[PDB]
């Protein structure tokens, strides 16, 4: 069995569990008062509970993905890169940038 | 919906491997591909030689422009600048003056064939049905000057096609 995409369908469990536990710590380094940490954490914790309850079932892969484990692993792989870029460039924690000129209607 | 293009290993063991190898060792499928054109050669070709035979058409077809007139003389074009503004190429130009006394119907009326992308929009926008698109193919010139249509005149010379236009418009009122 193999996925349709170029990413190889490898039989690996707990691989999703490592990456989802890693990203939670990165979020709790610099932003704390920001809403970015407060909202993303509760989605990841909801997804981690489904992995712990269901043992290698296709129904667990069907939850919020429905394209096997290979597509879900790609969602976790770029999550660490997105969290590190959000930690490096301050945007979520700080808001002080100038407002636009008053015009919008065409 | 899913249909799948991949065969997923047609050969398995012994019998299924040999015939998949036979088509690559010699040819077989190339000889089978040769037979496709072989029967295609015998069946009669659908070919039309233009100076004698003519191709299929329709009751409504757009070609070279020609403006129609009433059965009892009189130019049907009323001069509105209606067809001028709708024209997406801006090929049609119209400047109007009063005709002698009373009547007010046109003076300048040029349709560029250097422009004009052929819509039938000017046929549709016309309330009096002046420009009606006739079944035309024959138009070939030496210059742009000979190609672009002058102040009516050559458009009025569409009388040779107006007999067909009158027949075609009878299939146009209450559309098809």
């Amino acid at each position: 069995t193999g996925l349709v995409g170029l990413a190889v369908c490898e039989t690996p469990h707990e691989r999703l569990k490592i990456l989802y536990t890693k990203i939670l710590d990165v979020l709790g380094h610099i932003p704390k008062n920001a809403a970015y940490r407060k909202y993303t954490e509760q989605i990841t914790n909801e997804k981690l509970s489904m992995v712990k309850a269901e043992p290698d079932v296709k129904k667990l892969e069907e939850r919020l993905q429905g394209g096997q484990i290979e597509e879900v692993i790609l969602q976790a792989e770029n999550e660490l890169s997105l969290a590190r870029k959000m930690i490096q460039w301050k945007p979520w924690e700080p808001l002080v940038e100038e407002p636009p000129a008053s015009q919008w209607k065409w | 919906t899913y249909k799948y293009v991949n065969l997923r290993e047609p050969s398995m063991d012994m019998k299924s491997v040999t015939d998949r190898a036979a088509q690559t060792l010699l040819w077989t499928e190339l000889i089978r591909g040769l037979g496709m054109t072989l029967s295609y050669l015998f069946r009669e070709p659908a070919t039309i030689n233009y100076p004698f035979e003519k191709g299929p058409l329709s009751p409504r077809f757009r070609g070279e422009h020609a403006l129609r007139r009433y059965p009892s003389g009189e130019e049907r074009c009323i001069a509105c600048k209606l067809c001028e503004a709708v024209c997406p190429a801006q090929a049609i130009t119209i400047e109007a003056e009063p005709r002698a006394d009373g009547s007010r119907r046109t003076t300048r009326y040029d349709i560029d064939m250097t422009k004009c992308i052929y819509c039938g929009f000017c046929q549709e926008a016309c309330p009096v049905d002046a420009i009606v698109e006739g079944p035309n193919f024959e138009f070939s010139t030496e210059t742009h000057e000979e190609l672009l249509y002058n102040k009516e005149k050559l458009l009025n010379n569409g009388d040779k096609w107006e007999a067909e236009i009158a027949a075609n418009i009878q299939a146009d009122y209450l559309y098809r």
Partner: protein, 234 residues
Amino acid sequence: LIEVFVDGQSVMVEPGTTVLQACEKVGMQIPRFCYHERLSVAGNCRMCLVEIEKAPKVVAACAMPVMKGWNILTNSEKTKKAREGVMEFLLANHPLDCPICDQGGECDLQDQSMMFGSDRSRFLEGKRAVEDKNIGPLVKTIMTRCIQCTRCIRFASEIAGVDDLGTTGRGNDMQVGTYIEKMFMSELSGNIIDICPVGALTXXXXXXXXXXXXXXXXXXXXXXXXXXXXXXXX
């Protein structure tokens, strides 16, 4: 000055200000046929009908003033049902000249059907036609295209000086003409063609020469006659 809210937004207006004059301050133009700039305030069409917050009958914008602090809506449910209806009454006895007609895009009645009036259908059968009225040099007048209003009638009486235009009948036969066969005087009566909303009175010298569509406009002061400024030339 008393303030009264129109379409929820509040606008300050004078005590003797008209309803349509108050609407201009809120940046909204009601459908018009009888002028508000210089010509005298008169009814005789009932197009500019607007419904108040608590009123059984709609009042005309030209006649009725605001006076007290009352709410009036321009985009109301009753107003849109009115505006579509009155347009149908105007066009039940209209000669159909639009492609031949001297105006086309410049015509105020032509725009109001597109903007306000009912589009899908118009119930009508058999329209009456009026005989052509006598006119001298300027404005080739056609009585059929006329909607029979009071705009040019008051123009000759007040703005021009010499009165000629009036009423001739009673029903759908009353003409805006002079009734007696006489040519219109010059003075300043050449501007009467520009006043009329319909394509009834339009300059005979530049008739059917160019439509309102495809004409580049430019403003320039006139050389002939002193104290003349701002005149658009196509």
